Amino acid sequence: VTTFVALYDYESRTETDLSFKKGERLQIVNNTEGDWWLAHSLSTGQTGYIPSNYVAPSDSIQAEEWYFGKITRRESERLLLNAENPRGTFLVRESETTKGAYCLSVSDFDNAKGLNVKHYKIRKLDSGGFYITSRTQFNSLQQLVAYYSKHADGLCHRLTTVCPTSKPQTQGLAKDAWEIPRESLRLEVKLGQGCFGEVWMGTWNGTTRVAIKTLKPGTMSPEAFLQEAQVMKKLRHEKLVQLYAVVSEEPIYIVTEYMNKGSLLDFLKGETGKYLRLPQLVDMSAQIASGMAYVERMNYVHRDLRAANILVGENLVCKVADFGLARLIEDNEYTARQGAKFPIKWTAPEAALYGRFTIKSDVWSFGILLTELTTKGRVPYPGMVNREVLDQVERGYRMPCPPECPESLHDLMCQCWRKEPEERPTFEYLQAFLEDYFTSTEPQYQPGEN
Numbered sequence: 001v002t003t004f005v006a007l008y009d010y011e012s013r014t015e016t017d018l019s020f021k022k023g024e025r026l027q028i029v030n031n032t033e034g035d036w037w038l039a040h041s042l043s044t045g046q047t048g049y050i051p052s053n054y055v056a057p058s059d060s061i062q063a064e065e066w067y068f069g070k071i072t073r074r075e076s077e078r079l080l081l082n083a084e085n086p087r088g089t090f091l092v093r094e095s096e097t098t099k100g101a102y103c104l105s106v107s108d109f110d111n112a113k114g115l116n117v118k119h120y121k122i123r124k125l126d127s128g129g130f131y132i133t134s135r136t137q138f139n140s141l142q143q144l145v146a147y148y149s150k151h152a153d154g155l156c157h158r159l160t161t162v163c164p165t166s167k168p169q170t171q172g173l174a175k176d177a178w179e180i181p182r183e184s185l186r187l188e189v190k191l192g193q194g195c196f197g198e199v200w201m202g203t204w205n206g207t208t209r210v211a212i213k214t215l216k217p218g219t220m221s222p223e224a225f226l227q228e229a230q231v232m233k234k235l236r237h238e239k240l241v242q243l244y245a246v247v248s249e250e251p252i253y254i255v256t257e258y259m260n261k262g263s264l265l266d267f268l269k270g271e272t273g274k275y276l277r278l279p280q281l282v283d284m285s286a287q288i289a290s291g292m293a294y295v296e297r298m299n300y301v302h303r304d305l306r307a308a309n310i311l312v313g314e315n316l317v318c319k320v321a322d323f324g325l326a327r328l329i330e331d332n333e334y335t336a337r338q339g340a341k342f343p344i345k346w347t348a349p350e351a352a353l354y355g356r357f358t359i360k361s362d363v364w365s366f367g368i369l370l371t372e373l374t375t376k377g378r379v380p381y382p383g384m385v386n387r388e389v390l391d392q393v394e395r396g397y398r399m400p401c402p403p404e405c406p407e408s409l410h411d412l413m414c415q416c417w418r419k420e421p422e423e424r425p426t427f428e429y430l431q432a433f434l435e436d437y438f439t440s441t442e443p444q445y446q447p448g449e450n
């Protein structure tokens with residue numbers, strides 16, 4: 001029987017879940033690959049559902065605060081480069097270069113590079129021992145961290161600070177919570193107004209902060225909504241806004257992850273946003289491309305990709321929002337890709353002309369989104385009204401290179417805007433291109449042989 005330990009505090013939301021404190025010991029009914037486990041506390045003896053991502057086996061590597069598992073080099077750098085982190089802030093992760101190996105990622109400063117992250121491979125020997133340098137070996141990652149927490153001994157710096165972890169969202173609000181009562185939601189702060197409804201910050205069952213989108217009655221069939229919502233429910237990625245729950249009865253409420261920095265469009269035309277440098281803008285582009293590459297892998301289609309439907313979190317985290325919904329709009333104009341509410345400036349010609357919405361028409365939309373990113377959120381086709389856009393683009397008009405956009409990114413936009421959808425790049429390629437946009441001759445890792 002496995003004893004689990006709580007990685008974070010969890011506050012009870014229902015009559016059937018179990019509250020616990022970080023460090024609390026728990027046992028479960030079944031080690032399912034589900035999001036919620038039936039548990040009891042070895043501390044309190046209380047019984048209830050717990051979020052499975054809030055625990056790890058006791059004395060597991062996953063139980064360590066500094067162990068971040070399958071995080072990429074890029075995402076580790078995002079966390080480590082936070083300006084609140086002292087020099088020597090660190091985490092350990094799986095290598096993405098070498099199977100079964102690990103990586104020590106440490107925040108450093110030198111006048112040569114300023115704030116930077118050093119990456120050290122931790123080789124695991126087939127014989128079982130761990131090392132960065134073959135001359136200093138350890139029976140465990142715990143002993144390796146304990147050691148370099150005292151002496152740098154070749155490292156850029158001593159391990160001072162465990163990289164802070166933002167407390168993770170649960171997968172779903174509660175076990176089998178999906179179609180929820182309207183009265184379980186409180187709408188607190190109006191965040192904004194779209195063409196088809198409003199979005200509120202609010203609470204589920206009193207205490208869980210969520211975003212709530214309220215659709216005007218007549219917007220979409222509750223029947224069609226629930227069928228699509230079952231597809232949307234299956235989409236799970238770090239760069240997609242989670243769909244939590246629905247109120248199926250009109251007026252339809254859509255409950256999603258609250259993103260505290262708002263839309264990318266407003267962010268770009270804001271205080272932090274309007275002074276962002278190209279490398280920051282390319283990193284945001286690469287995050288959006290990764291979310292859409294997941295959409296692509298899942299054989300799904302966004303249908304409304306634009307800066308307004310990217311939401312921003314801490315550390316310039318960008319997530320894709322409002323995927324799939326556009327198909328369900330009943331409005332006759334919108335359905336005909338016509339009228340004041342249709343985003344013609346983001347729409348591939350074959351989608352606008354024939355209603356052929358595919359991942360390739362989302363690639364077109366991504367190219368337009370790149371113009372928003374490189375012009376601080378300027379409206380595409382600035383000198384044109386919506387009623388004249390499709391005519392121009394079908395005749396082969398394309399936006400020129402924005403004034404502060406490098407030609408290479410404009411060339412990428414032009415590939416996204418190929419007349420033939422099958423000639424447009426994949427999101428897989430767009431993500432690989434944008435992630436490797438800037439080249440360095442710098443060592444990928446710090447060589448272990450010193």
Ligand SMILES: Nc1ncnc2c1ncn2[C@@H]1O[C@H](COP(=O)(O)OP(=O)(O)O)[C@@H](O)[C@H]1O
Nearest residue numbers: 191192193194199211256257258259262263308
């Ligand atoms: N999940 C969310 N978290 C936080 N704010 C959100 C979220 N979804 C939407 N918003 C806010 O609500 C506004 C309106 O969204 P929406 O109704 O989808 O309209 P549009 O996509 O046309 O801008 C967004 O600009 C943003 O400010």
Ligand SMILES: [Mg+2]
Nearest residue numbers: 194308309322
């Ligand atoms: Mg939106």
